[PDB]
Design a binder for this molecule. Sequence first.
Ligand code: G2T
Ligand code: GLC
Ligand code: NA
Length: 441
Amino acid sequence: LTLVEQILAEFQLQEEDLKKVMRRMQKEMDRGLRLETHEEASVKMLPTYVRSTPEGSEVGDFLSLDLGGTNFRVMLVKVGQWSVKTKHQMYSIPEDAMTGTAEMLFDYISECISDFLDKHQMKHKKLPLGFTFSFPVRHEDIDKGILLNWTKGFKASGAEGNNVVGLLRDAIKRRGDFEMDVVAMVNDTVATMISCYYEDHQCEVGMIVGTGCNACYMEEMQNVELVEGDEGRMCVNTEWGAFGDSGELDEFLLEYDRLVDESSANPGQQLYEKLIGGKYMGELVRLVLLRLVDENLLFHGEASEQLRTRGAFETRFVSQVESDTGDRKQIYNILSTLGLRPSTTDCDIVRRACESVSTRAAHMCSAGLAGVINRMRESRSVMRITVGVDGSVYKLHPSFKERFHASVRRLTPSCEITFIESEEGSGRGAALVSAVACKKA
Ligand SMILES: CCOP(=O)(Cc1csc(NC(=O)c2cc(Oc3ccc(S(C)(=O)=O)cc3)cc(O[C@@H](C)COC)c2)n1)OCC
Ligand SMILES: OC[C@H]1O[C@H](O)[C@H](O)[C@@H](O)[C@@H]1O
Ligand code: NA
């Protein structure tokens, strides 16, 4: 074995390593659900106030917001023998509107809503609005929720500890250009699950593998100790990205993981997500390549100023390197632009490094989902379940979903799992929750 492959081997996780991760995820999930341990629990298991229901929704036009990254989305969902039609617009949030105040961020969002309404000839219409807000929140109801903390590099001031729906409403009123009834606020896991439920009624799990990584599932109300009642089920936002925040993953953490965390916007937070999320994947690869260079095993021990810059190795490059046919052309072109003159062997090392990071991400992720699924099987006493999935890592990365599917099946012995790749899920599902909520409001 080459010294390179001896270093890459550190990413490997045995079936027993994954079973240990899965069991600990289940223990941490149990801790978040119980009133006695909820405050100390790293995995928060936050109640969403989205309850189980077999009823049809309200008919009409529903507006949707999807805030969870730099690219923000506004959707119009037309609900009408049910038919669900969508119209969207994408918006890139500038750095100044993501690092300033919450007011600045919500004013940018409102400006985009106004633009959407203009482009779709509906500035004079007062519509119900579903808001997908992909950050940890403590809900008081389906339409009231306090931001616990920012994740994925978001850092707008005056948002944490405040009602997110109130910040949205305040920004709309300050603008005075249009009117809207914010009827619902959901996590993107929740919106993905709801959106996929419309296609398949067996869907009771929502999972995101994009910039960040999280999961939601339909929990029995008696197990949801933070909401009074035992009748029916409620969707629970695990916020499993925070798994490992109380040492649960310390035995598995590599030097690359510590460095990624130390230089991140949230040191010591979202440690499990930092192993999987597309926000960190490219950076993990960069750090690995630099260790190989420093050990005189890659690029003749010489790295460019670009390769030595945090963020230079983009998560899309990881996906691109793995999509290479074998001629090493795609790999060469990524590395040439990065200011390197790589050999055929260097290109191959880069691919092996990308595969080591992405395979670990898929495996670590499968241990988490297996924990949720096996926990559901036990609560419901051969389990047939559908999991709704969204995110660029799962949808676009070569063989991420293949490795993840295989690994998750190995870990869930008496379960028959169906995966639904959600197209617009993260946004459409907020409008569907809004349409169901509207029955009462
Ligand atoms: C304001 C009311 O308060 P509340 O207490 C709190 C609440 C407020 S919204 C909500 N639940 C939901 O929105 C909800 C939505 C679901 O998805 C759809 C429902 C209908 C359609 S359709 C075909 O267009 O008819 C499409 C998607 C599924 C679901 O649960 C399954 C995933 C599981 O159930 C089978 C729950 N709960 O209501 C309880 C109903
Ligand atoms: O976007 C995926 C996930 O990213 C982060 O983990 C957020 O905390 C979580 O709320 C979100 O669901
Ligand atoms: Na309860």
